[PDB]
């Protein structure tokens, strides 16, 4: 009993220190965030709206020093979990949504005593699309691109966990088979500007089940 | 252009 | 009265000495790992959507888990053996669908009942849209939906998640529902896998049923 | 005896609001009563497709609480006042077979009484379990829907009724259905481990398409 | 920012240095109007319309008062609606909670009179049947307080006719007349008047 | 370089704190505020016909300037600009006139400060307007309008503006079920004839057909 | 009525 | 008018 | 029965 | 697998 109360005691001291004694990145203390979708369904095609709503994780993973701790400071904790109103979380946002997007899952992160917060939130979106060919051979294809909302390339840099959207989690059952879906970063440069603006651009091709 | 892009718009 | 006035008094008391003077339990870990025990009663199946392959219940979960920092003696509260307390104020599980459609939507009141010997049993009642195809529903042989529920963030070497019997609660069903039950099973399972010792633990929710006649 | 009494009013909320620890609720050595009683408005939806029925109807939610009284002499001979309904406890009385969230149509405002009585009145629009047929014939169709505490035994609240009639005073004239009947019943059960009544309110209906 | 300074005092002042709402000691007049908008829709499968709405709320409260020449001159300030007590007018008839679609903010002059006007759609019981005919529909919908009687809250209108100059001219219903009407009953219990204002609106499918 | 990191870190978290904790209650006749709006067309996702209501997507841009929220950047490590929660300072209460169901918020509400006070604010929002879609099946489409302005300032409180009275249309969904004919954000001002103070809207005007 | 009413059920 | 006007209507 | 109720099930 | 699980992500 009397090490498992030490144990409690070492976690909720870690969270104090961490917590109730960061304003976000800037150019000088830039931030990588990198991105993976696990692609769960595609539920709604909506031709009458050009409207396509999917269901996914999306996993978001950075890094932070202020975060950082020695595991022998603290008991050997290595790793703990808290919720996402505990820490800052970046704003990554679908440029082409065309309702709020849905919370599916608790808003729970887990941080790792090398600063590292992996933060994966289960998501329903509605986004503009034309399903136009989804009946065929060839299917319909749609993209949403994914980034920050304030944010240069200078400040927050996106990147992809691979360029493969994970579907080993595709509901079986699904209206829609997938053909491919991708996750890629692009680097834009508007005409007068040196800043690099970074999406991660994901890519769905699918077709009706036959 | 960037006076679209919410990241850049502020430039403008 | 003035004993109605003391019972409260002693209430008020237990209540400021779990919530008020230790701040809140910090989760499970595996030093000090968590049983938490899930059970289903099925109310109805409102609606099954051919179109989106979406089908949507209602139910109560009941969820079961026991803390230390819960206890304590009766003797020293009036005799008190348990109350009634916000779900707000104490930690509850993360569990969750891990494959529905929609936010899941709250049909009762938030409270959890607390228990001397650190026991809390919370009961929310729930409207689940979740992926299912429902062909078949009308005919003989029915249509069969699957459902994982599991932590969000915890193994389970942190949180142990367990049913104490793998049958679902169909005795508050709704008999004159559009589907009637064939069948529904709550079954914990186990997997491994091949990086990690620890086991992760979902409970599957198996539900076959039809249009009824 | 204007700001006097206003005064007297913010006294009075401070001593039974501020002055005291909160009420932890009922129990087994301290029970409480409380009395539901439905006006019943409309029937807004009948669904045959999910078997769900929408209604919406007043709830008045009454009970009475030592902790709540006071002595008119000393507050400037107040005898009632309005308060937000958050200031203060209130029941956990719910539908057992709604399908979606309950909808609140009202402010969130009590009455209390300087004996400790409050009267608490949601108006309120509820989707619940109900099969709609036979709604299109002379006898009609007949849903009933169960209220009651969710954590609370009878022996911490008791639940009564105020009469087993539905009120139908304030029923919209012009809905697409008439009420051949509305009743709300107190029922009571018990179970072979314990020795404590479980008390519902059945509210029942029996209603047909408005010719 | 010689506005700036005072306008931060006065507001510190007056908020943070309970207004228990009205009583019989100390009642209140509320007055209302309404400017009707857009009926948006008409559902007969149901009986249930929606309106949209600005619903202007006046009434006055000493404690909101102020000296101009102890604020600079400052004789009217702009407010979240928040800070402030605001009555619980009500339609008593609704099917939907009330959606807002306005900021939630009060304009307060220093002889203590407030000003509230939130826009709103409501959906409330109505059978349009008649709707497509030169006679129209008519439907009605009550206002009121949800706690307070007449001798609490004395609420009033200043005409009986809705202000309909800003209503959509493109809507699929236009109006044929709408009126908002006080109305006062007694009940044989007791003394006190219960007043509803009473809005009645006759409409018709644009031709 | 991390010691370096951890400065920009303390002068980035002294200066919200010296603006924000240290530290507006809005316009007024002697304290007047400019309000620059402008609107990037997204899509139109609905046109109903059975209830006139028209369903957009678009990011509003609000731009406006206050003394209270500049400084001097040699003071705070060069800092010549930050962003923050919208919740943290005033929001002008620019609001559609018209709007039938309340506006549904679409990204991050967060400001972009600069250090000479100025304020930029991009909601993207979906908004359900009043629009009588009558036209949209045939060449000419359907002509749709939207006002907007403050809920509670005149002209002389809230002095709203536009840089340009051509709507961005840039971004506009290539495939939306509606093409764009024109889309116009024009700034209109009227007197009522008891008051001296101006009255100010910007009407947003939309042309648009189905696409073919 | 008195005590259909919400603003004066409280007396019944 | 002022008086069907938000911003102008506590004129009234 | 006692198992299915939320108001007793936490006796089970 | 582990990476695909959120409650197992978090080490990959
Ligand atoms: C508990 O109940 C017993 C039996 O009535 C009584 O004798 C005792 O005083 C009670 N204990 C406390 C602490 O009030």
């Known amino acids: 009993d009397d090490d498992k109360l030490h144990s409690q005691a070492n976690l909720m001291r870690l969270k104090s220190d961490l917590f109730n004694r960061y304003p976000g990145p800037t150019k000088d203390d830039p931030l990588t965030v990198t991105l993976g979708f696990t692609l769960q369904d595609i539920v709604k095609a909506d031709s009458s709206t050009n409207e396509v709503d999917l269901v996914y994780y999306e996993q978001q993973r950075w890094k932070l020093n202020s975060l950082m701790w020695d595991p022998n400071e603290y008991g050997n904790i290595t790793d703990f979990r808290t919720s996402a109103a505990d820490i800052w979380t970046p704003d990554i946002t679908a440029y082409s949504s065309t309702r709020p997007v849905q919370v599916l899952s608790p808003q729970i992160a887990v941080v790792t005593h090398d600063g590292s917060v992996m933060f994966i939130p289960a998501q329903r979106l509605s986004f503009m699309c034309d399903p136009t060919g989804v009946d065929s051979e060839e299917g319909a294809t749609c993209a949403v691109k994914f980034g920050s909302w304030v944010y240069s390339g200078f400040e927050i840099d996106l990147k992809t966990d691979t360029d493969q959207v994970d579907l080993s989690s595709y509901y079986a059952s699904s209206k829609y088979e997938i053909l491919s879906a991708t996750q890629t970063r692009q680097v834009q440069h508007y005409s007068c500007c040196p800043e690099p603006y970074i999406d991660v651009n994901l890519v769905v091709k699918f077709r009706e089940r036959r | ?12």
Do not use: L, T
């Open chain 2, 1 to 12: 252009g960037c006076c679209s892009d919410p990241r850049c718009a502020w430039r403008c």
